[PDB]
Amino acid sequence: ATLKEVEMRLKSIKNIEKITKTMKIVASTRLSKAEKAKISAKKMDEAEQLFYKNAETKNLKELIVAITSDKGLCGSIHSQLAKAVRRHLNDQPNADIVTIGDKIKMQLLRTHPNNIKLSINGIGKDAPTFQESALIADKLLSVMKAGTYPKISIFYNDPVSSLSFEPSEKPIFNAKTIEQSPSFGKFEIDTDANVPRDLFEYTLANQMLTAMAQGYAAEISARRNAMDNASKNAGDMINRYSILYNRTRQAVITNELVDIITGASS
């Protein structure tokens, strides 16, 4: 009800506004740079998972890896993905969990503290790179012994448009599971040096980079979208408070004048 209050309550929102409006452009510059990594990733995966299609490979304990990031302000990316892991993970309250990005953690940490055995950090900054995808894979083999699992599953957000997305699941097959397939014999693979070992380890890295690249571009599209709605919504409050400001300012001049007036009359 005082000028100071209304003027500074305005100064909080006017920046909130300008800031959310900046990260929509920083989000838009980051948009194309990341639509590009998604294209390069898919294209690589298309050459790799096409072999699994021909071998007609299926699955004869469990590891779940769910991918988002650390940063919020991207709408419901972390939420309805976490929810997709809830829907699927009803069938397996004993599936070990590695999470990529702190937000899917605080989602999955509060719903199932114990399943999370591993958690990755500082992810959604720039676009995902192979190094990330690889060293995360490396540790999934190291302490998580990813090899010694019947079924592996990657969780990530696929971007359908620039307005919506779909939480998706795709499987990972190991050294063993590749061999005992409907059509391993279609290919003249040399059965000498540990090949299925590698094609699994190489795929573990790759199918994640591809999940992250898609999860990233989904996130980046969701940011520019949530921030557009926010900057819009902020301006609205700025408008409503510029009006209250103006009322109060007028009131202040009048009320001050009435004291001078009463004082003058006596």
């Binding site: 949530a226 709605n229 926010a230």
Partner: protein, 118 residues
Amino acid sequence: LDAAVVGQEHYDVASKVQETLQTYKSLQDIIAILGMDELSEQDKLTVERARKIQRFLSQPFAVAEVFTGIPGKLVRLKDTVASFKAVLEGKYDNIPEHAFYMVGGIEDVVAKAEKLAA
């Protein structure tokens, strides 16, 4: 509003209701600017719940029948106390917000929730 008058159960409910509503108030600015997505789960649930309390506090008066379109309901104190007590206890979370709006006690929510689900 004192336990030595209304009993501790009544006091405790009234106060938790009040804490709940208060949390929503402290949050309104952030809910309106940034939406529900940018709340922690605790908050998201409290906000989800507060809005059900908010609406449950509404009541069709008999003398505003013309503006409510609905007969005037009246709720016995003991029923208000218990009805709210239960909402806090997370007993009605699966229910959509609309079933608390302009009804009497908790029996009336159950009713309107099934009315909507048909």
